[PDB]
Each structure stands twice: as structure tokens, then as C-alpha cells.
mmCIF file of C-alpha atoms in Angstrom:
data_model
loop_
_atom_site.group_PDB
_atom_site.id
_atom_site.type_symbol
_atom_site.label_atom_id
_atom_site.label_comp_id
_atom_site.label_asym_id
_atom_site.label_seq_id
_atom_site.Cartn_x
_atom_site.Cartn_y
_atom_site.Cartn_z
ATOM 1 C CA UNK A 11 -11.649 31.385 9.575
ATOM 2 C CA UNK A 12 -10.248 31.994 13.194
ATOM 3 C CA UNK A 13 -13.673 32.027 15.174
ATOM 4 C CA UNK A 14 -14.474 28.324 13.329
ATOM 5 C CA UNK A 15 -15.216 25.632 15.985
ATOM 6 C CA UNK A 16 -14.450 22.560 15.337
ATOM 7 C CA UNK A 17 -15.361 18.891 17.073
ATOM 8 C CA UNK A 18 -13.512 15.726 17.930
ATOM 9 C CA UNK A 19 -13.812 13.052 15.487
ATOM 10 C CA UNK A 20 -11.827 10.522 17.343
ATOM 11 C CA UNK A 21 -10.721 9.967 20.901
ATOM 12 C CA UNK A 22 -7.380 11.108 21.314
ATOM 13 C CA UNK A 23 -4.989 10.425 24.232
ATOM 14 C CA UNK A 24 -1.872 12.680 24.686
ATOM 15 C CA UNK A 25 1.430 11.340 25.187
ATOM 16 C CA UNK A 26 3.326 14.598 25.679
ATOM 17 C CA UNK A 27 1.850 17.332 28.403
ATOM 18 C CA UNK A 28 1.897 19.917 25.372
ATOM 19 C CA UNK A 29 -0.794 17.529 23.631
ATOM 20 C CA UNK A 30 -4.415 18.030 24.428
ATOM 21 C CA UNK A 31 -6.552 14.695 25.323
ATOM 22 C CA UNK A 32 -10.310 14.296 23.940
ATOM 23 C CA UNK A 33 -12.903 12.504 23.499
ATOM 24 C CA UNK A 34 -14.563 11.940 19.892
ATOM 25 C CA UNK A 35 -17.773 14.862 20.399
ATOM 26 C CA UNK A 36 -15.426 17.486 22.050
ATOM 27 C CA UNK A 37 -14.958 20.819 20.666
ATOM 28 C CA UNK A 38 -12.663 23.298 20.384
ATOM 29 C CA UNK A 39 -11.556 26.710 19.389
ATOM 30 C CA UNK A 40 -8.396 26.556 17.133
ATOM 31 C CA UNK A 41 -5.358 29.226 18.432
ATOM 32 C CA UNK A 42 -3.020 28.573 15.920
ATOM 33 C CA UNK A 43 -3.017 26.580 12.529
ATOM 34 C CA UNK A 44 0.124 27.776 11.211
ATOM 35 C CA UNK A 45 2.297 24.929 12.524
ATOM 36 C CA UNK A 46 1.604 22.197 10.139
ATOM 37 C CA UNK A 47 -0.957 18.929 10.704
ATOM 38 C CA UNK A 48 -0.585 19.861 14.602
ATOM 39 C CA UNK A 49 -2.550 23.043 15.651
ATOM 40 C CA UNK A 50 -2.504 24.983 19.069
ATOM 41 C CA UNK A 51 -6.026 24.724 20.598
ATOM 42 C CA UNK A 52 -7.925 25.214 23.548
ATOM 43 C CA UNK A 53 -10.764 22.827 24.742
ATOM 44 C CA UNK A 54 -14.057 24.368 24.962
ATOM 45 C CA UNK A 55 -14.676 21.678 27.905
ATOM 46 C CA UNK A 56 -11.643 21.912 30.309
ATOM 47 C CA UNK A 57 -10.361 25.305 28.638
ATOM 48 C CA UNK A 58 -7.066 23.916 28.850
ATOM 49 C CA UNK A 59 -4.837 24.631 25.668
ATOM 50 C CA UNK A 60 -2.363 22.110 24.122
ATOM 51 C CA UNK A 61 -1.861 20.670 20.316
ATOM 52 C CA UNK A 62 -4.077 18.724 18.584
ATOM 53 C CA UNK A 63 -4.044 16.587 15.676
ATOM 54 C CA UNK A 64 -5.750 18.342 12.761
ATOM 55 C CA UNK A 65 -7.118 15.150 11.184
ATOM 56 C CA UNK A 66 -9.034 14.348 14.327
ATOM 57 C CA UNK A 67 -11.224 17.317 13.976
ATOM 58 C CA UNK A 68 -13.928 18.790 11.865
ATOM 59 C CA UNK A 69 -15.930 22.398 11.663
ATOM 60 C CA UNK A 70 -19.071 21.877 14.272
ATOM 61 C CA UNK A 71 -21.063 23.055 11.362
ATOM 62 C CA UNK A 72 -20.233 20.278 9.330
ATOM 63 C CA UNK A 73 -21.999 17.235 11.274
ATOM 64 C CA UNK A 74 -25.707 18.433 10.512
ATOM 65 C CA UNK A 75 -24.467 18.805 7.113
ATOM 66 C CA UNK A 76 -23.183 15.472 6.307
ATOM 67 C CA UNK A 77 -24.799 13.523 3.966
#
């Protein structure tokens, strides 16, 4: 469950330097989910880590399998 990427659904802009900004498209590796709707993550473009809004993302595998 850990090593699941996932992907921007949305652009996102931070309002707090402890957020993470994004693009919709951008994808990330998730370092902790056990905080609620917000999880710690680390962008897989700038490598910079921050929180993220959990409804704005979505596993990488699951865009070539949407129907």
C-alpha cells in the first residue's frame, strides 16, 4: 500500500508553506496517510515534501483503467 503512486487530479495551490502545490498530472509518493483527508507527501517532480489533499489524488494505475 506504501510504494502506491498516485497522480494529481486537480491543480492545487498551497496556502500554508507545509502544503504542497501541483498541477492536475503530477505525481507523488505518499509518506504518511495516517493523518486524516490530509496526507504527508513528496512530489515526484520537485521532490519537495508537504501535505496534500487526499481527494485531489488518485493511484497512477488507475487512469488507464478508467472506464
Amino acid at each position: 500500500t506504501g510504494v502506491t503512486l498516485f497522480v494529481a487530479l486537480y491543480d492545487y495551490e498551497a496556502i500554508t508553506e507545509d502544503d504542497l502545490s501541483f498541477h492536475k498530472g503530477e505525481k507523488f509518493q505518499i509518506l504518511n496517510s495516517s493523518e486524516g483527508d490530509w496526507w504527508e507527501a513528496r512530489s515526484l517532480t520537485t521532490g519537495e515534501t508537504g501535505y496534500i489533499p487526499s481527494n485531489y489524488v488518485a493511484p497512477v494505475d488507475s487512469i488507464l483503467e478508467h472506464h
